[PDB]
Amino acid sequence: VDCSEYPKPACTAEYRPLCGSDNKTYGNKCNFCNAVVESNGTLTLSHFGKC
């Protein structure tokens, strides 16, 4: 996963989860990448799937 084209103003709402470095399961790549942007680059990907 590459969050360069983010942020994005809207995300589709399918569930294909990713596990962030904050221990939270992000529901899809778009939701994960908007939160990486929101944290000003400090959140990273721990692994794929739920945390």
């Binding site: 103003p9 809207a10 995300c11 709402a13 569930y15």
Partner: protein, 185 residues
Amino acid sequence: ISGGDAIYSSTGRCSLGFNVRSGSTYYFLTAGHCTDGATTWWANSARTTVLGTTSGSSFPNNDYGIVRYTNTTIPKDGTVGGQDITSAANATVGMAVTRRGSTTGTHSGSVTALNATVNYGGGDVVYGMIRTNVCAEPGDSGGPLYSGTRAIGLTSGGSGNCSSGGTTFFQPVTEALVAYGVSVY
């Protein structure tokens, strides 16, 4: 299985929009971004109860897809959870609406605008969408937006979340009904 219940494809989980039919053939509608690239659909994460196979998909530009049921025994209720749906209608600004989805359950709000353009990026732009102040989160895609016993739309996406509040856009269901020649029941 009814509107708002979970559906799984080989790549992820969405929600069932509405059960619809043409003649004696039963189908279910959901979001096009869920049908794109999916062939078979199941009722559970274990993939042991088959529901059916994708018969049409339209995403981006619109956001709707239809799955033909191949499972003969599962009950195909014409409801949203237990609410009956008896007709389809066009959304209007100020309309009170409710969405049901497999991750967040049922949430209500109102339609705030019509004919909105939502750019999901990379060329995936959808047009003609219903804007609302109802929240939605991953997993809720394709679930129904209804108002009373009226079917109105299919969940597409948006921003925000149910804890803090959000904005979700929906594909008008009448467009899907007409593209496939099916009806709610």
